[PDB]
């Protein structure tokens, strides 16, 4: 129990995710992290709800609106399609609408964004969407991974400064190396609170 | 667009990990694994550490099988993975853990 | 109850053989496999011996993938078995051939 | 084409099918044979229809009524249930009924029985059934494999003698040896008319 929240996880299924610099692929390393996060969020509180959305491929696609049915959630993660480039602002708009319509309005709202690809948007553009989320009581967690987009951490951290309220929103930067992506995230507030 | 695997009202959930030790941090499933055992196992019930029964002639990228409810016949080296798909006995989810490569 | 696996209107048919060579007598699939090639393949289209494209990081016991109609992107070592499940592009059946271990 | 027929394949999913004397299992040796037969019959004539029925488990179960949809047919053979003992009389009756109501009456009618288990019936009762099959123009193919009652070959042969009509019915005795079940069958009239 304790924290009661509805989360929308936005996963990166862009063409950049075929890369094996995260072994065996960025896609597989994300999948394991997302799977672990769904189990941790559902087992934290039986009234938590988790939904899943893809950001690229052939368009932003909701795989499930937020639910407490862990089997239904995990079933979405088999047979992912891969291609294109992420649509970060659209995916955020869609996830927030899903969160707004949650049946149990007692739940806090949280979007987790897996940013595995370059971010094409502008820093000012990202600040406004951050301010909008904050006004609507929506927290954000950002997982920055992938490989040469130098302004990417700056843009993502500007998003974070704009959305953050009472330490509810976080960013994690994790390059590839000896630890799998999921293992780095297990220590961070993405998993701990 | 959604992939779906089913036997009646039981959903089949395929999950793939590069390393089975990753499952140590996968709740709720971790509590059913005995990480000292060799060869893939299925559970006859949902007691703690219940995944202990040896699956017959498993693919060797199979890591294990967890039925999330109800009970079924508990025996080593008799039921292949295919026959276990018919043995939900009211379980709503059959989780099949696979090793990536 | 019956086992069902599917992606939209596409039926997924899992077939298992102890020996790849048994497939050489399996009509009509013996005409679509290219048994001179090493490692499991899928077809980009319908033609004789069209199963030529290398599946990425395949399970050790995967023998090949046959889509029974339509066309799809044809590249070696790019699409995993899981992603191929989204690439029927109108095929009514995806045949997945497995080796018994 | 020219031979146009509707076939019901009766498969043995009794407890006896777990035996490894046919490598790797009687069930898997039977399954490969059935898959090859379904492919051969459906490709022999696009108007052929094949159905599949299990004789044992928790009672006789029709997996599919005769169809020419090879994908629908082959999909029945993944995830078979195993148990009990066969109900050969009930199975043959249900096969006969499915064949009697085939859509295209120009089709010939054939039943193939995989007898991988002991035969818990008396010769006189099998001769009655085969007599009924013969009267209703249904041909029979019998696959005799596995062990342990001494008289099963004679009982199966008596059934064949009563149904056989102008050499249209056949029996194959295949023991656990070097050539797998399917290999033995390929060169017999089960596959070659």
Author numbering:
A (entry chain D), D (entry chain B): 0 to 146, 148 to 193
B (entry chain C), C (entry chain A): 33 to 133
Paper passage:
SAP05 is an effector from a plant pathogenic phytoplasma that mediates the degradation of host transcription factors, including SPL and GATA family proteins, by hijacking the 26 S plant ubiquitin receptor RPN10 independently of substrate ubiquitination. Specifically, SAP05 folds into a tight globular structure consisting of a parallel five-stranded β-sheet (β1-β5). Although SAP05 carries a single domain, it utilizes two opposing surfaces (hereafter referred to as Lobe1 and Lobe2) to interact simultaneously with TFs and AtRPN10, forming a dumbbell-shaped structure, in which TFs and AtRPN10 have no direct surface contacts. In summary, SAP05 bridges the TFs mainly through electrostatic interactions with a hydrophobic core, whereas the SAP05-AtRPN10 interface comprises predominantly extensive hydrophobic contacts.
In the SAP05-AtRPN10 crystal structure, one asymmetric unit contains two SAP05-AtRPN10 binary complexes with almost identical architecture. Interestingly, the N-terminal loop (L1) of SAP05 becomes a β-strand by packing against its counterpart, forming an antiparallel β-sheet in the crystallographic packing. Appropriately, the α1 and α2 helices of vWA domain, which are not directly involved in the interactions with other subunits of the 19 S regulatory particle, pack against SAP05. In contrast to the acidic Lobe1, the Lobe2 possesses a strong hydrophobic path for AtRPN10 binding, where a cluster of hydrophobic residues including Leu35, Leu73 and Leu69 on the α1-2 helices of AtRPN10 plus Phe49, Phe58, Ile47, Phe61 and Tyr127 on the Lobe2 lining the central interface. While at the edge of α1 helix of vWA domain, the side chains of Gln27 and Glu31 are accommodated by hydrogen bonds with the backbones of Thr48 and Ser50 of SAP05, respectively. Of note, a number of water molecules permeated the Lobe2 and vWA interface, with multiple molecules mediating contacts between SAP05 and AtRPN10. As a result, this binary complex buries a total of 833Å2 of solvent accessible surface area. The results showed that the mutant E31A, L69T or L73D of AtRPN10 was unable to pull down SAP05, suggesting the prominent role of Glu31-mediated hydrogen bonding, and Leu69-, Leu73-mediated hydrophobic interactions in the recognition of SAP05. In light of our SAP05-AtRPN10 structure, we found that residues 38GA39, located on the α1 helix of AtRPN10, do not directly participate in the interaction with SAP05, albeit they are in close proximity to the SAP05 surface. However, the substituted His and Ser residues, especially the bulky His, would induce steric hindrance with the SAP05 surface.
